[PDB]
């Protein structure tokens, strides 16, 4: 089971894969093969950005499927969002971003509706319309993420 990951310049990276291999795994094989760090890699198939926690079968990737690899330099503001199971999810954000916005980023990466997310910082349940600066959330600050009861 071969798949083809193609870069902007039409460079092909060919990968031997299995249905139950995750996207994180595919990104690791790319790092191994090309020297590109997984955190700079974005993978696209059927016009969908592919999520680390999902498998190739999840996305209906079969033999000789073609994926597109898109690369990012990255800017200067990350925060950590931490579940009480200990999964740390890192996010690229700006001071003027609202909690609503962060919650939409969490939706993408985890599949959790915003109305079900509770974000906690400095011991407070964070409000959707207030900003990171409002709460003095800074570079490499950690927010707790917990579910609606």
Biggest sheet character: 5 strands, mixed
Order of SSEs: EEHEEEEEHEEHE
CATH architecture of the largest domain: Roll
Q: Roughly how many Å apart are the termini?
A: 43 Å
Strand content: 25-35%
| Count of discrete domains | 2
Widest sheet: strand order?
A: 2-1-5-3-4
Question: Which of globular, elongated, flat, extended, rod-shaped describes the shape?
Answer: elongated
The quaternary state of the protein chains shown equals monomer
State the helix count: 3
**Helix fraction?**
10-25%
Beta strand count: 10
Fourth-level CATH superfamily of the largest domain: Phosphatidylinositol 3-kinase Catalytic Subunit, Chain A, domain 1
Structural class: alpha+beta
Radius of gyration: 18 Å
PDB class: signaling protein
Keywords: NF kappa B signaling, signaling protein
Assembly: monomeric
Entry title: Crystal structure of linear diubiquitin
Q: How is this structure best described in words?
A:
The protein has helices at residues 23-34, 99-110, 132-135; strands spanning 2-6, 12-16, 41-45, 48-49, 66-71, 78-83, 88-92, 117-121, 124-125, 142-147. The strands form 2 sheets. Strands 2-1-5-3-4 form a 5-stranded mixed sheet, covered by helices on one side. A 5-stranded mixed sheet has the order 7-6-10-8-9, covered by helices on one side. It has 2 domains: 1-73, Ubiquitin-like (UB roll), CATH 3.10.20.90; 74-149, Phosphatidylinositol 3-kinase Catalytic Subunit, Chain A, domain 1 (Ubiquitin-like (UB roll)). With 149 residues, it is α+β, with helices and mostly antiparallel strands. The protein is 19% helix and 32% strand. The relative contact order is 0.15. It has 3 helices and 10 strands. Strand 6 (78-83) and strand 7 form a beta hairpin. The record marks 68, 144 as: Essential for function.
């Amino acid at each position: 089971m071969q798949i083809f990951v193609k870069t902007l310049t039409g460079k092909t990276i060919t990968l031997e894969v299995e249905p139950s291999d995750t996207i994180e795994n595919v990104k690791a094989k790319i790092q191994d093969k090309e020297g590109i760090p997984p955190d700079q890699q974005r993978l696209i198939f059927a016009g969908k950005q592919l999520e680390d926690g999902r498998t190739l079968s999840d996305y209906n990737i079969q033999k000789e499927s073609t994926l597109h690899l898109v690369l990012r330099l990255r800017g200067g503001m990350q925060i950590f969002v931490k579940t009480l199971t200990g999964k740390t999810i890192t996010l690229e954000v700006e001071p003027s971003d609202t909690i609503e916005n962060v919650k939409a980023k969490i939706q993408d990466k985890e599949g959790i509706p915003p109305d079900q997310q509770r974000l906690i910082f400095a011991g407070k349940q964070l409000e959707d319309g207030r900003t990171l600066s409002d709460y003095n959330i800074q570079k490499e600050s950690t927010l707790h993420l917990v579910l609606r009861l």
